Amino acid sequence: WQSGVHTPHGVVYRGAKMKNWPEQRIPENFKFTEEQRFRTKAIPRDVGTIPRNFVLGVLYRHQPCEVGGLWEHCTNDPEIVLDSKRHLREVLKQAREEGFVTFERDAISNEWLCFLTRERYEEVQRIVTAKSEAVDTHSGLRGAAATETSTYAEKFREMNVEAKEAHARRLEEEVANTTRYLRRFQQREIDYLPYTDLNGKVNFMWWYETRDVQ
Amino acid sequence: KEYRLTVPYRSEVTMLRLANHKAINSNIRELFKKPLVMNNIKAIPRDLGEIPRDYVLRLLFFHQPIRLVDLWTICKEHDDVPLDSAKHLRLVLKIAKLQRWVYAEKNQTNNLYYYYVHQSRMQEVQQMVRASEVRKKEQESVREIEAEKLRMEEQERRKVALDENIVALQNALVSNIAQIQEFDPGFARSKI
Amino acid sequence: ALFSCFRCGYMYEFAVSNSYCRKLTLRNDHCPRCDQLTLFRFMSVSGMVGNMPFKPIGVPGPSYATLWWRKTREGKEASAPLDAVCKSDRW
Amino acid sequence: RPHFPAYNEDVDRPMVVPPDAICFNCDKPIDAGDVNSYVWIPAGNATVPTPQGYFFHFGCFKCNRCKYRLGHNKFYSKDGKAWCIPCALGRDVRVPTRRWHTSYVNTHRTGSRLTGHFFPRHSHQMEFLFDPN
Amino acid sequence: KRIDTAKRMRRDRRRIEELKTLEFWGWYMKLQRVRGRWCREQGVSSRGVYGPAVDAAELWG
Amino acid sequence: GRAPPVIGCTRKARYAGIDDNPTITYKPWDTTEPLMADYGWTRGKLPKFRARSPFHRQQIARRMVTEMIRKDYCIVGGARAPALRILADHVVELAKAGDTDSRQQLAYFLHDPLMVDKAFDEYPRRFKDMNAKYAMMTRLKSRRRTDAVAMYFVEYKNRDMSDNHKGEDYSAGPERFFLPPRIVETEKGIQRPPHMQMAFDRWASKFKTEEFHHWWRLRHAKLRYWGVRNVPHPSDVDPLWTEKEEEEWHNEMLANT
Amino acid sequence: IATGGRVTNEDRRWWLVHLECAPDITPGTFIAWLDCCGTHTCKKLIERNIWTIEQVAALDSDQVDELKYREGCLKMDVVWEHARTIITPLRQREVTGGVESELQGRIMELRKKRELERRREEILKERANVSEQREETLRKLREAIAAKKAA
RNA sequence: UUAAUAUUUGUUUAAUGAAAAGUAUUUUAUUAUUAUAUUGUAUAGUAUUAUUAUAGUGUAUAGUUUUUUAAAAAUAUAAAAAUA
Ligand SMILES: [Mg+2]
Ligand SMILES: [Zn+2]
Ligand SMILES: [Zn+2]
Ligand SMILES: [Zn+2]
């Protein structure tokens, strides 16, 4: 995916980037032929466990979501694993096929929303809790830092309901800010390699790493 | 000898027609084409008893009478049907005739099923079905009450979910603060 | 061909060539819903992999079940909730 | 010539083995998919008990009253138990010349596969395909 | 006795076949994992004679 | 305007050239794409070797290409050799293209997805510096005694640029068909890809059991009952794999590393 | 195009006169439009970061040699010659569209548009007026029938 | 003599217990459990290693592993356009 040929010039997606994929500059006068645009074939994205779990975590964070702001929420999420809006749409389609999430339409705002199914909500909650525990185990801090974090968590728990909601809004906006800042220092490289299973079908194995950019 | 078999690129239907192996989820029609002493296909298990009997009894007491094709179509129109075929319906109706539940009277050119032997018990079963529908409505009212209870439980779930979101965002926040402190701690010390 | 999982009913489509005619009836494939190896059964028939001699690519074509299965997961009423996020035709 | 389709399509209503599954003569749990020792009789109905088809063990698909096989592989449900037609109609107990305490029936709905629900299920499902919407 | 023995033999054969298939699938997945590791270590990519710019263009898939 | 003296597509002789006259002629399928060529005796088609049907011919071609990609060479007989060489060229073309459609087409054609992966891994870097004719065909002076058919050694050209088969010697076969092939003294320290090494080790350990010795003696008995001569008695036969032979073969394999 | 082994003045004139058959081709269109630009050639050019006929025409002979004898593009010379031949009128099309505009004119364009919309409106006005006349005749028939019933 | 003949030509396996029949040198064929003498277990038939699944139970995804050949006529099958 390039900024000029697949999207209008000037736009850019704040997400994980593919490894060794050059972001080559495309001239402004570039245009596709009407017949050449039909025969364009895109590479398949990863709708696997990691992307579906990321999207399910975002959909559990925002209850419920809307298809318009879903990409904004995914970009604000710190550990984004999606490549672009096409990857997001493919992961949404895979979640719909698997039955994790359903798509409804609000008769008030005339917009499509993404709700979580009642049967899979328990598994989504389990996945979110496991991811939270993994992030807690991976995060490093000293004794005083851990004590301050525990005190802040206890204060947020003892706060009221609307107080907790305002605290969550402030926390998520500060998370968005710190993610936009940290993205300039490090990014997420997605690597892929095709292979063929025992059924003669071609599918890709994917790796996800983090690399510092200075 | 078949052109479809000699063709270099075989179709999926052509490859299906070669599924003569007696196996689970095989070509049932191609396995039935061979004789009964060759293929191990027993008789079709048709479930009879009160389960199809009461169903067809309700569906026939609703109309009183209907022809066999009309009864089959009206049954197939519904979603849950213990009957798999019109032949199954015919066997159930025949057993019911033998047990004196339905009786078939021939009109000028057709036969119609009626409930004359157990007409009192037929009305009793119809009233039982009506009371079952009333109990289903009462269960729907109880389900509205349980939906209010589930709205309370969902408010509790929203509380615990926002608490989990707070404890997660705080973890992501401290992780990003640690990363920014590792790279350039000036921004981390400015944010405190 | 179109296959369904024996345990959950998850369905995926993949054409079967002449080198996999033995695996047309039952496929041992990893299920994304069951998260493990499950047995897949043959549900509906697709056209073919190759081309019928002196016949177009459409011949023979998939059955009504395959065409209906696709139309429920990707179509007018299926992609409408997905055309608001990316509009797959574009990136 | 057989006049019945093969590989019944379950895209309208999938017929899968439930996770919890008991018998009709036994009311005891059965193996789900590891062993086909059970007998599945699907008809596409949620009617109690054991929706989308009940289940029987191979050894226990026999009549519950006389403890004998079935005549034409057709049992009669009687207040939760499976009886035979001579038992249900009230006739005398007839000992069969063939196998006594087991009936000729395939495993895993193989014998009840050629009849049941096929594609399309309803009439409104075909017009869904032939219409652009 | 014949009935029971035949059913038991077929069931045990089915179970052994299931175990064999499961083990072979696991071994093939491990094989693909090792192959991917070696390809990433040696710089080999099965994306053609071209470089990553073609895949970035993703005009051919 | 008028019509040619002979109208319609008329089958000409085997060595007759083209006519270049206006004739409404249709192709069965697009034969310009790799592995989709047609077989015939005209010049625009591959020489159709003898087979019971076009389906059987395509199956023979698929197994030929699979074994070719497997062991880097193949000794074939008759008209199968030109078809095998051209199909190997087509496989190399698909591998150098490296599209997902190319992967799927080679997977549809081949019998082994592991061989599909091996091809797409090795052949691009192996034939990056070659334009065409990636396979070499050599007509041997020895013929198959049974039917007196001409034998052909078909192989790939860039032997040294390959990851597998680097330094392999094909002047004489190995000691056993399950043992690794011969290696020249200069390339003794070469190393093979680990996935292919594990696959070969599994397939070779398949033959180290006693059930294989029983299959071997039973094949002796079958071919002796079927009238085939020069087949010794299963009492006189001896196993292909024994303990001391396996020990010395393991020593040689560790020497070749 | 065959070119028999080298691009000539006849081939350049061929490309020039065929440039009329592509009015929507701009100097910034994709490289797959150029003659003898196969998939291999297009992928190698995209590797070289060449997405445009302008960028093909701006190439050097040494770059063309690298693409032809080290990358594998056989007709790279033909693609480059086609680009260099057609690049000059494409710049004119992009800056002003001289050959496309001086022959029609905005005056004739607006005249055609206005006449088209007027004719399309007149086609429907004809049916409107004929239906009005039909309704008037129906009312006259009603009045005549009322008069005859009164008589 | 026909006869440089006709014919053969072994490169890819979808299925499960007897008895009649067949006696082919089963060297200790099996190695054991139970109990209790004695007796016997591998291979049809159509003049053959032949168009061949002997249908007595019983059910099933073990792929339960011998069919050459580089153009032609006539013949044999199968397909065979927007002509009728
Ligand atoms: Mg005989
Ligand atoms: Zn599943
Ligand atoms: Zn039971
Ligand atoms: Zn009974």
DSSP G76-132: HHHHHHHHHHHHHHHHHHHHT-HHHHTTT-HHHHHHHHHHHHHHHHHHHHHHHHHHH
Which of A6, A98, A198 has its CB closest to that of C33?
A98
Q: Are F108 and C19 a contacting pair at CB < 8 A?
A: yes
Is F60's CB less than 7 Å from nucleic acid strand H?
yes
Q: What torsion, rounded to 10 degrees, do the Cα atoms D113, D119, D122, D127 define?
A: 180
Chain G, nearest residue to A21 by Cα: G47
Is D100's CB less than 7 Å from nucleic acid strand H?
no
Q: Are E51 and G47 a contacting pair at CB < 8 A?
A: yes
CA of F213 to C1' of H12 (A): 21
Residue nearest to nucleotide H14 (CA to C1'): B21
Decide if C78 contacts C72 (C-beta within 8 A): yes
The C-alpha atoms of residue F165 and residue F183 are separated, in whole angstroms, by 9
Is B40's CB less than 7 Å from nucleic acid strand H?
yes
DSSP labels, F186-225 = GGTT----HHHHHHHHHHHHGGGSHHHHHHHHHHHHHHHH
Taking the CA atoms of F1, F4, F5 and F9 in sequence, report the sign of the dihedral they define.
negative
The C-alpha atoms of residue G84 and residue B153 are separated, in whole angstroms, by 73
The C-alpha atoms of residue A3 and residue A26 are separated, in whole angstroms, by 7
State the distance from the centre of ligand 4 to the C-alpha of B44, rounded, in angstroms. Answer: 18
Task: Report which secondary-structure segment, H or E, holds B105.
Answer: strand B103-106
C86 appears as a binding residue in the annotation: no
Helix (H, G, I), strand (E, B) or coil at A167: helix
Is C59's CB less than 7 Å from nucleic acid strand H?
no
CA of D97 to C1' of H19 (A): 21
Residue C45, burial from CB neighbour count under 10 angstroms (0-12, 13-18, 19+): buried
Residues 30-89 of D with CB under 8 A from B: 36, 39, 41-47, 51, 54, 61, 72-79, 82-83, 85, 88-89
Cβ atoms within 10 Å of A25's Cβ, excluding its own: 12
Cβ atoms within 10 Å of G36's Cβ, excluding its own: 17
DSSP state of F168: B
Residues 84-143 of F with CB under 7 A from strand H: none
The C-alpha atoms of residue F210 and residue F217 are separated, in whole angstroms, by 11
The C-alpha atoms of residue F222 and residue F225 are separated, in whole angstroms, by 5
Q: Give the Cα-Cα-Cα angle B39, B40, B46 (nearest 5 degrees).
A: 120
Task: Report which secondary-structure segment, H or E, holds A113.
Answer: strand A111-116
The C-alpha atoms of residue A41 and residue E61 are separated, in whole angstroms, by 5
DSSP state of B76: H
The residue with tokens 């802040």 is A152
Decide if A164 contacts B162 (C-beta within 8 A): yes
* Closest by Cα among A45, A43, G39, C53 to F94: G39
Cβ atoms within 10 Å of A201's Cβ, excluding its own: 19
Task: Report which secondary-structure segment, H or E, holds B137.
Answer: helix B119-183
The C-alpha atoms of residue F122 and residue F95 are separated, in whole angstroms, by 9
* Closest by Cα among C32, B159, B143, C81 to A115: C81
Pick from B4, B11, B12 the residue to mutate for testing the C interface (most C CBs within 10 Å). Answer: B12
The C-alpha atoms of residue C34 and residue C42 are separated, in whole angstroms, by 18
Interface check C36 vs E, CB under 8 A? no
Experimental method, per PDB record: cryo-EM
Q: Which amino acid is at A189?
A: E
Give percent helix, percent strand, percent coil of chain F, each to the nearest 5. Answer: 40, 10, 45
Residue environment code for D79-93, b if the CB has 16+ CB neighbours within 10 A, otherwise e: eebbbbbbbbeeeee
Give percent helix, percent strand, percent coil of chain D, each to the nearest 5. Answer: 5, 15, 80
Cβ atoms within 10 Å of E53's Cβ, excluding its own: 19
DSSP labels, C34-72 = TTEEEEEEEEE----SS--TTS-TTSS---HHHHHHHHH
CA of D11 to C1' of H57 (A): 40
Q: Find the length of chain C.
A: 91
Q: Using only C-alpha atoms, what is the Rg of chain E?
A: 22
The C-alpha atoms of residue F56 and residue F51 are separated, in whole angstroms, by 6
CA of F3 to C1' of H83 (A): 18
Q: Are A201 and F107 a contacting pair at CB < 8 A?
A: yes
Q: Give the Cα-Cα-Cα angle F65, F69, F75 (nearest 5 degrees).
A: 65
Task: Report which secondary-structure segment, H or E, holds A187.
Answer: strand A186-196
DSSP state of F171: S
C21 appears as a binding residue in the annotation: no
Helix (H, G, I), strand (E, B) or coil at A22: coil
Decide if B32 contacts B41 (C-beta within 8 A): yes
Q: Which nucleotide is nearest to B6 (CA to C1')?
A: H78
Q: Please state the residue numbers annotated as binding site of D for Zn(2+).
A: 23, 26, 57, 60, 63, 66, 84, 87
Phi and psi dihedrals of F151, rounded to 5?
Answer: -100, 145
Chain B, nearest residue to A60 by Cα: B161
The C-alpha atoms of residue F69 and residue F123 are separated, in whole angstroms, by 10
Residues of B in contact with C42 (CB under 8 A): 16, 25
* Closest by Cα among A30, A6, F97 to G31: A30
Which of D77, D114, D122 has its CB closest to that of B28?
D114
Decide if F212 contacts F199 (C-beta within 8 A): no
DSSP state of G4: G
> Chains meeting B at 3+ CB pairs closer than 8 A?
A, C, D, F
